[PDB]
């Protein structure tokens, strides 16, 4: 009921500020929970999940005024009103255009800065403390930031007309630099992207391709946990990137977006790069290309389109391109997720099983994305009466997620129940 702060801000040798433990930490230990300073649904999910709680409830009611924001209840619509009142007229005026996520997010940020009532999200680090990397920014990035600025000014014109209507310390250009640099993709239960937010305190964490911490979201609520034994004074790290990336791809996105090159052992040794790019470049690069179109359809929840593209690609390469190739792998993943959202459970189990061994290799021992994946496969097996396999995978998912999601998490509750149902049928038959 009164757990003490187990982490603290500190200055690193080279990585700027960071976060480190003040006490020894066990895997699964909760380090920090934070509400966002500000957050918003991402473009692809507007109208599919509740603007407030980010859950994908079946039937949503749109805000009468703007008909852009949608809510799962009067409760959520009311609770979100402080975050929505200053943007509503802006969204109405914008139609049929919709602003970029960063512009809508920042639009929420500026009013929260005036709050005056201390934000629990800024307990260790404020919005103004956030790194902007302005000195390191390329000219190409600065031009883009300038565009975001002008877009902001147009999008907000009904509510903000001059710099004097915002705090003086605030600077719009530097703000977008910070947003690009410090924002978090908010994922749901099934590890789907549903939103984006600023979590200034959490933003203290520096990057590693081999992190000692993981993050999982409870709606907009962010939970930070250790995923292995951490010593006193040891820097806490998370992974800014998708795990299914070559060391070259990671080096590029960390540079273009975060203005630094990673020096972790995985990046110094090109760890697992070979396996990732298994197969002939002439073959998998077509897949890599298609992946863009597919991921955009997935973001917009177009599962029928996603499935169509995937099984086309999948069947087309079955004779020459192995599942462990990360681009092929991603397609199998998308295919699986699509089948699940379309009730095609047997087909889902087919694609999902094929992701299992590659996921074990490419993901660390305890990673939330792997855990949830293993959970889905076990469930799909359970639904097909393949009890002993299901039992194996359900146990594994529990083993992982009790560390990544924590025991108190709702998915653990389902998991336990599934474990019982499954372990019964074993002794029974």
């Amino acid at each position: 009921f009164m757990e003490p702060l187990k982490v603290e801000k500190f200055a690193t040798a080279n990585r700027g500020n960071g976060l480190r433990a003040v006490t020894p930490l066990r895997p699964g230990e909760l380090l920090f929970r934070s509400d966002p300073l500000a957050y918003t649904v991402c473009k692809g999910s507007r109208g599919v999940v509740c603007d407030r709680c980010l859950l994908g409830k079946e039937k949503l009611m749109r805000c009468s005024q703007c008909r852009v924001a949608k809510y799962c209840s009067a409760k959520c619509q009311k609770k979100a009103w402080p975050d929505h009142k200053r943007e509503c007229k802006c969204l109405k005026s914008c139609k049929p255009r919709y602003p970029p996520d960063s512009v809508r997010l920042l639009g929420r940020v500026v009013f929260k800065l005036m709050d005056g009532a201390p934000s629990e999200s800024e307990k260790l680090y404020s919005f103004y403390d956030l790194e902007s990397n302005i000195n390191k920014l390329t000219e190409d990035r600065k031009e883009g930031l300038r565009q975001l600025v002008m877009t902001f000014q147009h999008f907000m014109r009904e509510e903000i007309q001059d710099a004097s209507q915002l705090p003086p310390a605030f600077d719009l250009f530097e703000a977008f630099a910070k947003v690009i640099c410090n924002s978090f993709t908010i994922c749901n239960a099934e590890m789907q992207e549903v939103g984006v937010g600023l979590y200034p305190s959490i933003s203290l964490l520096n990057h590693s391709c081999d992190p000692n911490c993981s993050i999982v979201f409870n709606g907009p609520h962010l939970l930070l946990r250790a995923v292995r034994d951490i010593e006193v004074g040891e820097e806490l790290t998370i992974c800014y990137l998708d795990m299914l990336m070559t060391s070259e791809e990671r080096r590029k996105q960390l540079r273009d977006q975060y203005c630094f090159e990673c020096d972790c052992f995985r990046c110094q040794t090109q760890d697992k790069d070979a396996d990732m790019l298994t197969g002939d470049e002439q073959v998998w690069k077509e897949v890599q290309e298609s992946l863009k179109k597919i991921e955009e359809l997935k973001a917009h929840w177009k599962w029928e389109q996603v499935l169509a593209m995937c099984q086309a690609i999948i069947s087309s390469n079955s004779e020459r391109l192995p599942d462990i190739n990360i681009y092929q792998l991603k397609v199998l993943d998308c295919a699986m997720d699509a089948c699940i959202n379309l009730g095609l459970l047997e087909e889902a189990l087919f694609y999902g099983t094929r992701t299992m061994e590659p996921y074990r290799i490419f993901f660390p021992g305890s990673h939330p994305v792997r855990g949830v994946q293993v959970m889905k496969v076990g469930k799909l097996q359970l639904h097909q009466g393949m009890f002993p396999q299901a039992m194996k995978n359900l146990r594994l998912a529990f083993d992982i997620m009790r560390v990544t999601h924590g025991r108190e998490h709702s998915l653990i509750e389902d998991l336990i129940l599934l474990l019982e149902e499954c372990d019964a049928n074993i002794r029974a038959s």
Binding site: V179, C187, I215, I238, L241
Partner: peptide
């Protein structure tokens, strides 16, 4: 896009 975490299209 942008944001710490999230898939890589």
């Amino acid at each position: 896009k942008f944001g710490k975490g999230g898939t890589y299209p």
